[PDB]
Tab-separated table of C-alpha atoms in Angstrom:
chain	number	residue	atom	x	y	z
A	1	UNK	CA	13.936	-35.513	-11.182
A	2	UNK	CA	16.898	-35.079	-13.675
A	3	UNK	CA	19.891	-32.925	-12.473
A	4	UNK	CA	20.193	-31.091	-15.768
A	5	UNK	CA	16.388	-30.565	-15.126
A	6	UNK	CA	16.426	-28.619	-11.703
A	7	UNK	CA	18.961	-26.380	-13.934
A	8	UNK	CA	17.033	-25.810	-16.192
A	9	UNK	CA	13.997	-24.694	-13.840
A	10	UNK	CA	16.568	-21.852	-12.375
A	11	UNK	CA	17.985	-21.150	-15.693
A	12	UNK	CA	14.720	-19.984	-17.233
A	13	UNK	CA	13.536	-18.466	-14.085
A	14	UNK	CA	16.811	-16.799	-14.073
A	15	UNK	CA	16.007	-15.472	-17.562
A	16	UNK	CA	19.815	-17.038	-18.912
A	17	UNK	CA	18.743	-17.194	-22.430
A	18	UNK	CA	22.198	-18.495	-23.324
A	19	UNK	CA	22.327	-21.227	-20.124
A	20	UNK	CA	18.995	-22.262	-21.372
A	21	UNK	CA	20.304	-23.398	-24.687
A	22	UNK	CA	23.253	-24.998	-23.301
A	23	UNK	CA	21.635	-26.795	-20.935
A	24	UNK	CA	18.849	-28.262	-23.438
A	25	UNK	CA	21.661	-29.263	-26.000
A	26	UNK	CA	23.150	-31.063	-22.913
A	27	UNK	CA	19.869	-33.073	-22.847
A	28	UNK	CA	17.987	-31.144	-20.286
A	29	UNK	CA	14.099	-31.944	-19.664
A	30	UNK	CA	12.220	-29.725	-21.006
A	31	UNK	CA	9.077	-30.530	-19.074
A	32	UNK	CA	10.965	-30.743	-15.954
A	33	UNK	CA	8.704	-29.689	-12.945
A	34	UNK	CA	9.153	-27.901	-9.712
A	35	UNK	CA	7.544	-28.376	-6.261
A	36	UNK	CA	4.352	-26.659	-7.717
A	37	UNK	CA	4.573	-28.210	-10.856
A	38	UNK	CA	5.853	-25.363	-12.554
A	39	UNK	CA	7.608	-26.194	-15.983
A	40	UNK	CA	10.336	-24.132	-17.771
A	41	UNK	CA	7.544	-22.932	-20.237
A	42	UNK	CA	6.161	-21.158	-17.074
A	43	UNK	CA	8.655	-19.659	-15.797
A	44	UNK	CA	9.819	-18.364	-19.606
A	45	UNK	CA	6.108	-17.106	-20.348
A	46	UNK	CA	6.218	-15.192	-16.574
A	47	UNK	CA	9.445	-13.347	-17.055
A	48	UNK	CA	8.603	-12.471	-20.334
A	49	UNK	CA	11.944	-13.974	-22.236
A	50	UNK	CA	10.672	-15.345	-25.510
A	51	UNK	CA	13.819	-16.763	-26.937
A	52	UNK	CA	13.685	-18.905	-23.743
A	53	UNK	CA	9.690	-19.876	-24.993
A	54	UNK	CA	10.774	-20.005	-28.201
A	55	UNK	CA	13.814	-22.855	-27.863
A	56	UNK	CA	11.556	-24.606	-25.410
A	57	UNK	CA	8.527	-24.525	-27.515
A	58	UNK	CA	10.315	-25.933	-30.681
A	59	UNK	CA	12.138	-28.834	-28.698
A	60	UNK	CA	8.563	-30.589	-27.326
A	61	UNK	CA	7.543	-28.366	-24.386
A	62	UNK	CA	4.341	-29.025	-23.155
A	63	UNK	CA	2.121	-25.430	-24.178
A	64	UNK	CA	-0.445	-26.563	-22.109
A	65	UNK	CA	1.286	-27.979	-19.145
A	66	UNK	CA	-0.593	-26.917	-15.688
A	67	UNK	CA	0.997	-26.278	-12.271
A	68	UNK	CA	-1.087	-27.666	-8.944
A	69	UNK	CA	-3.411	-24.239	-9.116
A	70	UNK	CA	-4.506	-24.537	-12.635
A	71	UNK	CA	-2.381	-21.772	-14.469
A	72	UNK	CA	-0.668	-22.386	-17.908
A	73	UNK	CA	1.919	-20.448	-19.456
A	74	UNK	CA	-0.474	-18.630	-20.998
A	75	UNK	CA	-2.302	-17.453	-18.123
A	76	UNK	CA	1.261	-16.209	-16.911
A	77	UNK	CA	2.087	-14.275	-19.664
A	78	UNK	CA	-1.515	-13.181	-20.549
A	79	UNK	CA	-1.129	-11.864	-16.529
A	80	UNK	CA	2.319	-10.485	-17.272
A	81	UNK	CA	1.387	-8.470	-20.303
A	82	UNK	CA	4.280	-10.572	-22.125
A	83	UNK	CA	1.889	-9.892	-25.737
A	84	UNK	CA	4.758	-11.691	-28.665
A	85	UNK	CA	4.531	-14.938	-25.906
A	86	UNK	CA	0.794	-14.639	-26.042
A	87	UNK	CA	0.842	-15.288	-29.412
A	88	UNK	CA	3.548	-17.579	-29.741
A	89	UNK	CA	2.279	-20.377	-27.303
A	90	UNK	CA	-1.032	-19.685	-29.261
A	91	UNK	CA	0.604	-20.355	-32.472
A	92	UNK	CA	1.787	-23.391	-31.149
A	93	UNK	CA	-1.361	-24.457	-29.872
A	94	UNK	CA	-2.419	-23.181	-26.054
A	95	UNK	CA	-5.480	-23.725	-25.133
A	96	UNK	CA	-6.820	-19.635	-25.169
A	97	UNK	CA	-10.028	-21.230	-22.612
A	98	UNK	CA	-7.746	-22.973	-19.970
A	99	UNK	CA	-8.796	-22.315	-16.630
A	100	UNK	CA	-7.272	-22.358	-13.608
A	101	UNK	CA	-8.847	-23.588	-9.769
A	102	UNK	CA	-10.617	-20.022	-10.097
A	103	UNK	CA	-12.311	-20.738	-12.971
A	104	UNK	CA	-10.070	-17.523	-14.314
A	105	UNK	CA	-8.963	-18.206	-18.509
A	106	UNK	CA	-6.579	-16.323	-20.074
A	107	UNK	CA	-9.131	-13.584	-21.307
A	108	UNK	CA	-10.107	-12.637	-17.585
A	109	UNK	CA	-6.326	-12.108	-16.449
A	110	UNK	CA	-5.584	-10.121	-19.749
A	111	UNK	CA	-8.179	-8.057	-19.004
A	112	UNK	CA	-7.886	-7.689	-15.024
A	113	UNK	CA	-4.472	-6.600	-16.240
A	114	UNK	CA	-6.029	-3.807	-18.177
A	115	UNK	CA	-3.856	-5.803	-21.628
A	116	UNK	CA	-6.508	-4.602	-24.657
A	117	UNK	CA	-3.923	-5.943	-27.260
A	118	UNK	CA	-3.425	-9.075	-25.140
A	119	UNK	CA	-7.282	-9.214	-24.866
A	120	UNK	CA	-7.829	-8.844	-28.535
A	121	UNK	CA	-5.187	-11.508	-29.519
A	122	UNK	CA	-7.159	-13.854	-27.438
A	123	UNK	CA	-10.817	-12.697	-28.642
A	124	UNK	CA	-9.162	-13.552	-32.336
A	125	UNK	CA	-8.000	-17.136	-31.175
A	126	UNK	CA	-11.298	-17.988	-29.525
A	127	UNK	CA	-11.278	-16.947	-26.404
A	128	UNK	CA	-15.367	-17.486	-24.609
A	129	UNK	CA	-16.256	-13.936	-24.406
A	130	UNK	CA	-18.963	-15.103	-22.176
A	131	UNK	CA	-16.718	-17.863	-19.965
A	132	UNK	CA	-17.278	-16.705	-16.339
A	133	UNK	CA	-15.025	-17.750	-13.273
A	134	UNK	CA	-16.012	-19.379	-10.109
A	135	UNK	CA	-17.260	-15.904	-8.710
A	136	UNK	CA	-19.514	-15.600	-11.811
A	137	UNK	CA	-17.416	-12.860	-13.394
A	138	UNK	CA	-16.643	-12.424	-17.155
A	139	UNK	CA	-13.691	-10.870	-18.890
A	140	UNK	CA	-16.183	-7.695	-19.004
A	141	UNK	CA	-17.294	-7.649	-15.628
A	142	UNK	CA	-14.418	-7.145	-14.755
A	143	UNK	CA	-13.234	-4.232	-17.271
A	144	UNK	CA	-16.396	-2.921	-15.464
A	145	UNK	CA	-14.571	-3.288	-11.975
A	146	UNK	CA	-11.784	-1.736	-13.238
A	147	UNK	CA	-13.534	1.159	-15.073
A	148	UNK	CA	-11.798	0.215	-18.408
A	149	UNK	CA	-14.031	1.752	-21.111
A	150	UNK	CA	-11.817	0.235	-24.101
A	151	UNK	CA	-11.443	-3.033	-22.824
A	152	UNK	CA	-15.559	-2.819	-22.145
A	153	UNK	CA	-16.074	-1.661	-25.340
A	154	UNK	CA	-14.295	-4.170	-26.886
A	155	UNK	CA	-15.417	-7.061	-24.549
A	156	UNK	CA	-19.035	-5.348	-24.899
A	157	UNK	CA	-18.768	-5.892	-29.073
A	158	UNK	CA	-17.353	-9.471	-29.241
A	159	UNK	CA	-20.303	-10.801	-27.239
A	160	UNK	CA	-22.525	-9.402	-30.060
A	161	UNK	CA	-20.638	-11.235	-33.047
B	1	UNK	CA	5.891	2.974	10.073
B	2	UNK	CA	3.587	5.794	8.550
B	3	UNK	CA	6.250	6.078	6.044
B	4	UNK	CA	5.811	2.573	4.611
B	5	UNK	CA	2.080	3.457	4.504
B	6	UNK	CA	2.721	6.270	1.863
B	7	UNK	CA	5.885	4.617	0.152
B	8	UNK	CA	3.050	1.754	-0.179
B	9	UNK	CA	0.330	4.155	-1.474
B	10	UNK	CA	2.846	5.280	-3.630
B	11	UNK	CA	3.125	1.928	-5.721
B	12	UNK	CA	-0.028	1.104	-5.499
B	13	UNK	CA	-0.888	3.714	-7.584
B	14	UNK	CA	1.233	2.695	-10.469
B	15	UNK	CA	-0.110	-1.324	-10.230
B	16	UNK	CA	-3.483	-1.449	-8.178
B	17	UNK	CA	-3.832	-4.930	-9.460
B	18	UNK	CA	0.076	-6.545	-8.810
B	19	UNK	CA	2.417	-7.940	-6.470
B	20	UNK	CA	4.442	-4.892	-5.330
B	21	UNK	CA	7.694	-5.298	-3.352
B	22	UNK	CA	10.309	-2.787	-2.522
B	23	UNK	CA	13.015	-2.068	0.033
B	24	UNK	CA	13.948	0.756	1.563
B	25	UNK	CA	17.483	0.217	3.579
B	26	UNK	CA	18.422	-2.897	1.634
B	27	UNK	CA	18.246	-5.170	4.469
B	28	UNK	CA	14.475	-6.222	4.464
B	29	UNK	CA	11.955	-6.830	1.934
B	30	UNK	CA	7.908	-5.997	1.868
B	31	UNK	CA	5.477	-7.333	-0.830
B	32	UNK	CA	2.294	-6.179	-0.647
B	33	UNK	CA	-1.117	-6.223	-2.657
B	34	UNK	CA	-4.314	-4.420	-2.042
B	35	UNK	CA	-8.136	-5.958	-2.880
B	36	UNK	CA	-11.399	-5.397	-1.652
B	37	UNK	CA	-12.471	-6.288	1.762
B	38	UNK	CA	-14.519	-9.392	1.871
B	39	UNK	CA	-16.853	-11.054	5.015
B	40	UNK	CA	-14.543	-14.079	5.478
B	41	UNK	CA	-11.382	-13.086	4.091
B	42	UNK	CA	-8.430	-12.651	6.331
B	43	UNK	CA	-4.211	-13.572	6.149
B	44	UNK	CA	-4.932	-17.174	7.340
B	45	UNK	CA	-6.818	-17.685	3.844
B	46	UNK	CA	-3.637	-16.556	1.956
B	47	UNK	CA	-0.723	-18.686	1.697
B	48	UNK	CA	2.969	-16.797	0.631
B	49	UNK	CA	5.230	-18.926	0.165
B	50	UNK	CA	8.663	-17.963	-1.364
B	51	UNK	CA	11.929	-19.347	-2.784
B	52	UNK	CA	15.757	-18.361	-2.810
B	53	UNK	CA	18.437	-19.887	-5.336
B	54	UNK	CA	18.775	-23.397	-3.497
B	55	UNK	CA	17.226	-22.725	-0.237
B	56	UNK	CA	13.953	-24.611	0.490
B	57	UNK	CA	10.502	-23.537	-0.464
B	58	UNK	CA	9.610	-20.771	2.765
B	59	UNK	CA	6.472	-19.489	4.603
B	60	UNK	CA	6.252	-15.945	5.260
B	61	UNK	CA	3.084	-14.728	7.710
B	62	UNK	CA	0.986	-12.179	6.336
B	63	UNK	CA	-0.492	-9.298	7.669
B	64	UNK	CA	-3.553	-7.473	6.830
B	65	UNK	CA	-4.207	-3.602	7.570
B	66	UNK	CA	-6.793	-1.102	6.267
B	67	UNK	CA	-5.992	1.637	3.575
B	68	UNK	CA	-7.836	4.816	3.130
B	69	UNK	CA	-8.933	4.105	-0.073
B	70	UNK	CA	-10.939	0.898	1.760
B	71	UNK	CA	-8.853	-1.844	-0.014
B	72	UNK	CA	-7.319	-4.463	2.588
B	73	UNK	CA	-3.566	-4.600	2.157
B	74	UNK	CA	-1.895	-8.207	2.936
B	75	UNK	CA	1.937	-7.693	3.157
B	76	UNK	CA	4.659	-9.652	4.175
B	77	UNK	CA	8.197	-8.672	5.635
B	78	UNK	CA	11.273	-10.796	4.542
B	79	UNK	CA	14.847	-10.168	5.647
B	80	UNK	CA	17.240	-9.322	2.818
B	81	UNK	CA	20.986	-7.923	4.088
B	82	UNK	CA	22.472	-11.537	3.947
B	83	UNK	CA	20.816	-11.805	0.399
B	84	UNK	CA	22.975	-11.027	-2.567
B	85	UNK	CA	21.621	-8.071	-4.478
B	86	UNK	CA	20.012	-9.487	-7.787
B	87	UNK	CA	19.611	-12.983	-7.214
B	88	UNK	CA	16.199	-14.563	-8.197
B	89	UNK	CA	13.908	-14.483	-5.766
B	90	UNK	CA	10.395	-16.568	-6.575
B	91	UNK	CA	7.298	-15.747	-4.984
B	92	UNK	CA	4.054	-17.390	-4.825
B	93	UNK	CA	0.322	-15.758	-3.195
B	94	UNK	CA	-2.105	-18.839	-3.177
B	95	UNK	CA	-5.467	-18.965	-1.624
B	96	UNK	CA	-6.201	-21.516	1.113
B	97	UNK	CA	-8.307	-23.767	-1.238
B	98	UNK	CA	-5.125	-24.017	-3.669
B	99	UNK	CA	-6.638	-21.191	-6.484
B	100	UNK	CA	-4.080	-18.982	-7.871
B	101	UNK	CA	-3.432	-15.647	-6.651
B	102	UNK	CA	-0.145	-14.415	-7.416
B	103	UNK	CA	3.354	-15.696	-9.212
B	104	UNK	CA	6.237	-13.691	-9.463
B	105	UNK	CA	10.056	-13.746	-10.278
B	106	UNK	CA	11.555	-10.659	-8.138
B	107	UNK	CA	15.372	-9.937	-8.132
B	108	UNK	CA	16.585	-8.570	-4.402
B	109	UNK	CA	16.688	-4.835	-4.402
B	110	UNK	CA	15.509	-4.443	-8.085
B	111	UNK	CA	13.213	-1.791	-6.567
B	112	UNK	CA	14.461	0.276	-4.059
B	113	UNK	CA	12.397	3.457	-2.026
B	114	UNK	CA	14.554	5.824	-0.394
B	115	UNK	CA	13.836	7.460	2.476
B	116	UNK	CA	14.693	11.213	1.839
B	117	UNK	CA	17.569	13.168	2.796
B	118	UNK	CA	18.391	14.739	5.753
B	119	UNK	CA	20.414	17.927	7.278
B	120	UNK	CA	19.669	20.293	4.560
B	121	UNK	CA	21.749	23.467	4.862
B	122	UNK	CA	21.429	26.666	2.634
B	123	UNK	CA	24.268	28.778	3.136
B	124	UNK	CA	25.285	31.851	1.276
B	125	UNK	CA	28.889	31.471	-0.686
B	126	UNK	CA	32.030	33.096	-0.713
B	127	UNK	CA	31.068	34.058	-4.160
B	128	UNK	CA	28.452	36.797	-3.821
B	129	UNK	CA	25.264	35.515	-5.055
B	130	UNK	CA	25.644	32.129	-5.063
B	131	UNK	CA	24.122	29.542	-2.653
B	132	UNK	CA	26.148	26.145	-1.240
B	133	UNK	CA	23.423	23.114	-0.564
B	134	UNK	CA	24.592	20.019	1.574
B	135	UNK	CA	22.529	17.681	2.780
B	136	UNK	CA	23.259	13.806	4.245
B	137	UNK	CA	22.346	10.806	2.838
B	138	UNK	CA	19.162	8.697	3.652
B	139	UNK	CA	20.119	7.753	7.370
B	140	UNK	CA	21.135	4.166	8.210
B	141	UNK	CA	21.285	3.398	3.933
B	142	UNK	CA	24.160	1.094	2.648
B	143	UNK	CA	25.863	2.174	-0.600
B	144	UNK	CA	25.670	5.760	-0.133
B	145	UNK	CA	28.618	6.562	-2.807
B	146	UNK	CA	26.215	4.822	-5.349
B	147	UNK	CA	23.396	7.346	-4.303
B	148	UNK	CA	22.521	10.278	-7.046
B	149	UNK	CA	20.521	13.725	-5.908
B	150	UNK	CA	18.149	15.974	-7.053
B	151	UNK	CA	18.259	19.861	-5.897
B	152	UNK	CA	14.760	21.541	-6.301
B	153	UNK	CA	14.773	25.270	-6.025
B	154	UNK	CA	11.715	27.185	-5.657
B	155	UNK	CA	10.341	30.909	-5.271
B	156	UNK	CA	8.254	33.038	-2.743
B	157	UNK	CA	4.972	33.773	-5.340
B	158	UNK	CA	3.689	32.400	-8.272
B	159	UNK	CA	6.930	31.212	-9.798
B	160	UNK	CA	7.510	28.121	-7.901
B	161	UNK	CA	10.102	25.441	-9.081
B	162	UNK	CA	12.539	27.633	-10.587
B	163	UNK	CA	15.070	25.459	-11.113
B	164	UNK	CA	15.625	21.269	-11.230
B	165	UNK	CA	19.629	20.224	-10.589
B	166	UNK	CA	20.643	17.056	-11.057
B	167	UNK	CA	23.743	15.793	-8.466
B	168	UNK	CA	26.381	12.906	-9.744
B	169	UNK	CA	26.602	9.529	-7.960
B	170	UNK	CA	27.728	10.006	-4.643
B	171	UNK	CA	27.778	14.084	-4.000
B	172	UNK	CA	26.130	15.457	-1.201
B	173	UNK	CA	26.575	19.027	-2.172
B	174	UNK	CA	25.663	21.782	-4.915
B	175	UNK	CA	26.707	24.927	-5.619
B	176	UNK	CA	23.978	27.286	-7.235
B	177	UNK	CA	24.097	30.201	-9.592
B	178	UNK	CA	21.513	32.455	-11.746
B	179	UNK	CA	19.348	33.406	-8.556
B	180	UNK	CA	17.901	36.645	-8.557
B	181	UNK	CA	19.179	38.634	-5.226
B	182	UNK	CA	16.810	39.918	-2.365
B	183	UNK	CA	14.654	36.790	-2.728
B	184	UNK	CA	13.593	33.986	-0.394
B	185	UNK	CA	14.352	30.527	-2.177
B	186	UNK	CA	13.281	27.298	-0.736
B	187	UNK	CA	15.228	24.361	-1.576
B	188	UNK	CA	14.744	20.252	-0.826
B	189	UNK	CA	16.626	17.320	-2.099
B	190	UNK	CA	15.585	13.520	-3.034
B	191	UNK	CA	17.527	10.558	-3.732
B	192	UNK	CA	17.413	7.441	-5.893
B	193	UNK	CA	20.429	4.819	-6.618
B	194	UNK	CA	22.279	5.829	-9.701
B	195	UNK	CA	22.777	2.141	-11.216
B	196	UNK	CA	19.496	1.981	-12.134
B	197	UNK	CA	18.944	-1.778	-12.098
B	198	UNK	CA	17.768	-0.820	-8.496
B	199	UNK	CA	14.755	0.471	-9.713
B	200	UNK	CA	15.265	3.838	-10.117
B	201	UNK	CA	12.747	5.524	-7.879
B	202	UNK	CA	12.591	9.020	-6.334
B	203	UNK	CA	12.385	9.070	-2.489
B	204	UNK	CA	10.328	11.884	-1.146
B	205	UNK	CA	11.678	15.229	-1.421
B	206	UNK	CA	13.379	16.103	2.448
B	207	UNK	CA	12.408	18.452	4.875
B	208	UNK	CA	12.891	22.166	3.103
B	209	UNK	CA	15.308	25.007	4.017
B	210	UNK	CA	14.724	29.055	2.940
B	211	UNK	CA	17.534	31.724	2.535
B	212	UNK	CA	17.105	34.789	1.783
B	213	UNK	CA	19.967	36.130	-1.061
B	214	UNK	CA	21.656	39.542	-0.717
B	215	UNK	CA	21.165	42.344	-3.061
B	216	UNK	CA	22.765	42.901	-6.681
């Protein structure tokens, strides 16, 4: 692809807030992809730097752009625990029931990740309380697995409503 | 060997469900996860692939060994000394059918496990009453002048930890006051790097050393 766009890639992997914005002003693609095709979004949401999300997500980043195994940006920083980027791609319109080649949405990482508040940002966005992965395993199940009694409880009284 | 086994445990413990990766000499790099044993699941159905600044996308083999909790721990061993400290390292865990496993963004030697100290030595001071601790650094570790210390000193009965001392970047030594005469102390010493962008990890406490003070 672009030149400016491989920068880009390492600049928000990199977590260079300020080489992000100079690059982009310098015309960089936004939705430039990696190998994987990872976007910058990704890599932002996964290292947790939300001015990075935020000047990507206001200049036509894709929120819902998918690398070759399924995950979004959300997935990555549901996964991360990164909860202001969890709302902000929501804001701007992620898809909170994505899921990736393991049938895994954004709800099951937050809450293999033991993230209530993540969990609960989701649940309020409409996230499928009952959406189980390929191994037949809902966001609950697994707070079961993991012996999480809050995120059970709370998983336990969204299926109800 | 045994030693990565605990420094392993040791992480685990704080993130049973991540990507973990340490080093403990700055020249070589382990990531490791831990899950639940399955019938058909070996390293072969695990792909880890990693990437460094503007070197091509890399396969690293895995290996799989038991844990005494019964998890399966996959791990994989990448060499580091070349590497510039802090550079972005991208990693990648994907399951042989393509799913999603793992994705992280590492920096090299953002988390770094000491082994512990070594040649402790008590010795009674010129100064009646007080005790002189050296010690060496972690054997065979670069950066040793950027390498901080922490003294433990600790009583025959009940009482224990006495006292905690803290030992500036790059000393090897201590000199310690306020202990009671005609009484066995037991000391030990750990290390960390001071920066802390290393990670800022204890390393298990070193092999101990008793003295027993003179009187008054």
């Amino acid at each position: 692809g672009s030149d400016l766009g491989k920068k880009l890639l390492k600049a928000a992997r990199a977590g260079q807030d300020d080489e992000v914005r100079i690059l982009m002003a310098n015309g960089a693609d936004v939705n430039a992809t990696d190998i994987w095709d990872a976007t910058p979004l990704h890599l932002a949401a996964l290292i947790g730097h939300l001015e990075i999300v935020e000047v990507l997500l206001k200049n036509g980043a894709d929120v819902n752009a998918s690398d070759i195994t399924g995950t979004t940006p959300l997935h990555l920083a549901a996964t991360m625990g990164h909860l202001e980027i969890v709302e902000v791609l929501l804001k701007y319109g992620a898809d909170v029931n994505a899921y990736d080649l393991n049938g895994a949405t954004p709800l099951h990482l937050a809450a293999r990740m033991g993230h209530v508040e993540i969990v609960e940002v989701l649940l309020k966005y409409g996230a499928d309380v009952n959406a189980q992965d390929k191994f037949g395993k809902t966001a609950f199940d697994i707070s079961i697995d993991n012996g999480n009694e809050d995120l059970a409880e709370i998983l336990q009284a969204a299926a109800l409503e | 060997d045994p030693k990565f086994e605990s420094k392993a445990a040791l992480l685990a413990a704080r993130g049973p469900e991540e990507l973990l990766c340490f080093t403990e000499r700055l020249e070589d790099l382990v990531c490791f996860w831990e899950e639940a044993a399955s019938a058909g699941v070996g390293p072969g159905q695990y792909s880890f692939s990693y990437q460094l600044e503007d070197e091509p996308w890399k396969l690293c083999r895995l290996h799989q060994a038991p844990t005494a909790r019964g998890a399966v721990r996959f791990w994989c061993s990448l060499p580091t000394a070349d590497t510039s400290s802090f550079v972005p390292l991208e990693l990648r865990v994907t399951a042989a059918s393509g799913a999603p496993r793992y994705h992280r963004v590492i920096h090299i030697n953002e988390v770094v496990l000491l082994d512990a100290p070594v040649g402790l030595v008590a010795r009674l001071a010129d100064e009646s009453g007080h005790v002189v601790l050296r010690w060496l650094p972690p054997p065979e570790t670069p950066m040793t002048s950027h390498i901080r210390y922490e003294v433990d000193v600790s009583a025959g009965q009940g009482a224990g930890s006495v006292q905690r001392v803290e030992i500036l970047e790059g000393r090897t030594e201590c000199v310690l006051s306020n202990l009671r005469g005609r009484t066995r102390y037991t000391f030990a010493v750990r290390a960390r790097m001071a920066e802390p962008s290393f990670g800022g990890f204890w390393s298990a406490w070193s092999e101990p050393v008793s003295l027993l003070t003179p009187s008054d």
